[PDB]
């Protein structure tokens, strides 16, 4: 059972720079590449005493890629696997989807092909991107499209990074977001939203780091990814593979946009003091003060929920805790399902990274649910897309790259149709 991970864009490979740091410390692999079978799902063992990850970093600008080539992990990543274009897409969907993708996507796909043929029991793909930028959105959609053509039936876990409502760094990200979704609908099977503002709030409230950089954000994102693949890597009391989210969390072929959350995010001094058990983290994983996407699920009604558990946890009390959640009335479920959960228990506790702000914790929870608050997020972005497109702002950049207004109009109405779908299913 193997799964390969591709990283697209500036944010993607920085997330990878934290993910692979976490995986190597988990499986006891030094950055030089050799240990001093659980690893077999991520690192293929070439020759003698050398494991090389099942990943491709790719970008259009060579700055962050060769920062990796010259960083500490020079020996770990295959020299060919890192892929770098010559010039950036520059926050331009059309440029990164029709002008430069036409040069880079063939080399990328003809590389993942030989990575898959190296693989034997491929579970699926998982992609890392942010849709606010140009490279991640444009050729991310192009790469996903041709992957769906090449394999199709295999699952694709998309861990995207959407722009926050109020805290934001770009200007044309509404155009890029809308245009990226329009293909993220019918290409991704399972798509997980990660917003930066909610992670800033978590690091401010729980981790009490008043000045967080991108390193800390990517650190606990890697914690989330590692927590939902730990079932594949290590055996537990009740394990769950990558195909189960496909069934257990997606009630309709176009409703797949999962909130994520994690608990306990606890610093070094708050562990040796709080008494940790399963009931309180099962609670704490459900407050909006600990979600990874700034939205209010109090407004929404849950469709399904998945609970990953790591560490010292028995099936009894996790069952009792989920019973308490089901019987509480401050949150409500949809009538379209009475059975709204899927547990999962793995034995190995979450590892700690040197310099990381989290502590050695006995047990932790990764919640992945699906609700209608995401339908509220899309409308919130749709509003500020209309605001800028009503005045035809910034359109000349995309038309100059070679596109038209037809795809703007049809992406706009596609998001409206999706809005109809959530308000319909929420009924």
């Amino acid at each position: 059972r193997e799964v390969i991970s591709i990283h697209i864009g500036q944010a993607g490979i920085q997330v990878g720079n934290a993910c692979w740091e976490l995986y190597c410390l988990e499986h006891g692999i030094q950055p030089d590449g050799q240990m001093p079978d659980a690893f077999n799902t991520f690192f293929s063992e070439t020759g003698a005493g050398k494991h090389v990850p099942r990943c491709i970093f790719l970008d259009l600008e060579p700055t962050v890629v060769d920062e990796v080539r010259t960083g500490t992990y020079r020996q770990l990543f295959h020299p060919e696997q890192l892929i770098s274009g010559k010039e950036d897409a520059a926050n331009n969907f059309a440029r990164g989807h029709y002008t430069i993708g036409k040069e880079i996507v063939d080399l990328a796909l003809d590389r993942i092909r030989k990575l898959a043929d190296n693989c034997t029991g491929l579970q699926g793909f998982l992609v890392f991107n942010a849709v606010g930028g140009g490279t991640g959105s444009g050729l991310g959609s192009l790469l996903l499209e041709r992957l769906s053509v090449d394999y199709g039936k295999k699952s694709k876990l998309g861990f995207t990074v959407y722009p926050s409502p109020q805290v934001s760094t770009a200007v044309v990200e509404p155009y890029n977001s809308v245009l990226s979704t329009h293909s993220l609908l019918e290409h991704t099977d399972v798509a997980v939203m990660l917003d930066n503002e909610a992670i800033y709030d978590i690091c401010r409230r729980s981790l009490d780091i008043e000045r967080p950089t991108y390193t800390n954000l990517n650190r606990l994102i890697a914690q989330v990814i590692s927590s939902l693949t730990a079932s594949l890597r290590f055996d537990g009391a009740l394990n769950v593979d990558i195909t189960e989210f496909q069934t257990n969390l997606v009630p309709y072929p176009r409703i797949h946009f999962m909130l994520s959350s994690y608990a306990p995010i606890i610093s070094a001094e708050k562990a040796y003091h709080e008494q940790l058990s399963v009931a309180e983290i099962t609670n704490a994983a459900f407050e909006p003060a600990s979600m990874m996407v700034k939205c209010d699920p109090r407004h929404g009604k849950y469709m399904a929920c998945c609970l990953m558990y790591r560490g010292d946890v028995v099936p009894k009390d996790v069952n009792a805790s989920v019973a308490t959640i089901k019987t509480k009335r401050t949150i409500q479920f949809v009538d379209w399902c009475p059975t709204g959960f899927k547990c999962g228990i793995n034995y190995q506790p979450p590892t700690v990274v040197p310099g990381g702000d989290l502590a050695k914790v006995q047990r932790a929870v990764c919640m992945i649910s699906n609700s209608t608050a995401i339908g509220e997020i899309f409308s919130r972005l749709d509003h500020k897309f209309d605001l800028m497109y009503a005045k035809r702002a910034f359109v000349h950049w995309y038309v100059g790259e070679g596109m038209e207004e037809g795809e703007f109009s049809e992406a706009r109405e596609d998001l409206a149709a999706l809005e109809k779908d959530f308000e319909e299913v929420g009924a």
């Binding site: 059972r1 029991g121 055996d235 009391a237 009740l238 394990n239 593979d241 195909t243 189960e244 496909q246 069934t247 257990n248 969390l249 997606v250 009630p251 309709y252 072929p253 399904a304 028995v314 099936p315 009894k316 069952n319 989920v322 019973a323 089901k326 009538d335 379209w336 399902c337 009475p338 059975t339 709204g340 959960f341 899927k342 547990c343």
Partner: protein, 426 residues
């Protein structure tokens, strides 16, 4: 002589069977390396019912593991009594169904079931006189329920004269693991009602409740639950393996428990189950065992037996006991709880005695009651299925695979007339 083959489907089936072969091997005195090291000659006389001779005192179990992910198989080979299974019996796929009944019944079954049918056909032809087959699996999972279900159908059309036992756990809403529990349980039940000879309905809910109340444990891991279920399976099958003053084989119990061909869903109970603190403060009498047997809190299903009437019930006693005390105790229970028994059948109680107790005890008993309270559980599941199917939730991961809608409607109809006829006979 009489023979019982073992088939384990799904992750729950594998671990349950692991504990089952541990406890049976212990009962016959064979060490975890597979050699006999026991004392009494009585154990050697009836090991062909569950074993085959390999080489130099090596006995292999007549068991076929079946799954779709190697994590189960590794967990089986890791623990003790894991190096006694024949590696050829480790028939095992590669992809994984992922809680999808259609994936476990139409796509992956088409390529795994020829292989499992080949190995079970080899194991059945290798022995002389089959008594029946014995399948342990779940009704919530995909690779367990669906694949085992098709296997049951293929086996029944092939060998229609041999008995069949199915130990199947049923999901409860209070202990709710996966989301498509009703979509899988309804379909599997729809096939079991026409294929299996009888079923032993289980759930983790009653097991957790029993460990809370009677055992008073702190951390009830899956090991103890599977240890309980294994104790039940050793109790139901003890009559063949050991001579007693009154024997009752599988067909004997079936004809004494099933009055109508569709009325073959049982609930089970096991005794004595006492805490270690109160283990020495008590005695071991037949009334002490009987009160723990007929307690409503000791059933291994989430169906209150006082909400209905028993159609029939059976008790399998193990240990040197007095048949007169056994019979008068059954008479006392049938008199005192006279409303909980059906009227148009007198003497609703079957009993049997074996002269070898399970190891570690003085005297034990296994209860198998065919009540009418199971209709509560089926309503409890069917209402969920109708709630989802009314609005077509989760439907397309099944429809887009080859199943169609009338299969779900048929499973509803079969659930509906089954609960109707249970209500009728109540």
């Amino acid at each position: 002589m009489r023979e019982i083959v073992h088939i384990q489907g799904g992750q729950c089936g594998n671990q349950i069977g692991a504990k089952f072969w541990e406890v049976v091997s212990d009962e016959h005195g064979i060490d975890p390396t597979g050699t006999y090291h026991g004392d009494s000659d009585l154990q050697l006389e009836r090991i062909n019912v569950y074993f085959n001779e390999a080489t130099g005192g090596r006995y292999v179990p007549r068991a076929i593991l079946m799954d779709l992910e190697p994590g189960t198989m590794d967990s089986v080979r890791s623990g003790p009594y894991g190096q006694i299974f024949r590696p050829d019996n480790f028939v095992f796929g590669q992809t994984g169904a992922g809680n999808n009944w259609a994936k476990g019944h139409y796509t992956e079954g088409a390529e795994l079931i020829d292989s499992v049918l080949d190995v079970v056909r080899k194991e059945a032809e290798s022995c002389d006189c089959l008594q029946g087959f014995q399948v342990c699996h779940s009704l919530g999972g995909g690779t367990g329920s669906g694949m085992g279900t098709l296997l049951i159908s293929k086996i029944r059309e092939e060998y229609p004269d041999r008995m069949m036992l199915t130990f199947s756990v049923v999901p409860s809403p209070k202990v709710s693991d996966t989301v498509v529990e009703p979509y899988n349980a309804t379909l599997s039940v729809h096939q079991l009602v026409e294929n299996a000879d009888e079923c032993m309905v289980l759930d983790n809910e009653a097991l957790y409740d029993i460990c809370f109340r009677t055992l008073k444990l702190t951390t009830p891991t899956f090991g103890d639950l599977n240890h309980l279920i294994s104790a039940v399976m050793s109790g139901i099958t003890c009559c063949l393996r050991f001579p007693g003053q009154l024997n009752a084989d599988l067909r004997k119990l079936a004809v004494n428990l099933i009055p109508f061909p569709r009325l073959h869903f049982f609930m089970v109970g096991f005794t004595p189950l006492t805490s270690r603190g109160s283990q020495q403060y008590r005695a071991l009498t037949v009334p002490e065992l009987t009160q723990q047997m007929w307690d409503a809190k000791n059933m291994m299903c989430a169906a209150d037996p006082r909400h209905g009437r028993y159609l029939t019930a059976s008790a399998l006693f193990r240990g040197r006991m007095s048949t007169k005390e056994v019979d008068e105790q059954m008479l006392n229970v049938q008199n005192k709880n006279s409303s909980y028994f059906v009227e148009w059948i007198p003497n609703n109680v079957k009993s049997s005695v074996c002269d070898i107790p399970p190891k570690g005890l003085k005297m034990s008993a296994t209860f198998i009651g065919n009540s009418t309270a199971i209709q509560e559980m089926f309503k409890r599941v069917s209402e969920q299925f109708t709630a989802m199917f009314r609005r077509k939730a989760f439907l397309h991961w099944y429809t887009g695979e080859g199943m169609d809608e009338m299969e779900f409607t048929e499973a509803e109809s079969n659930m509906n007339d089954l609960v109707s006829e249970y209500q009728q006979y109540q």
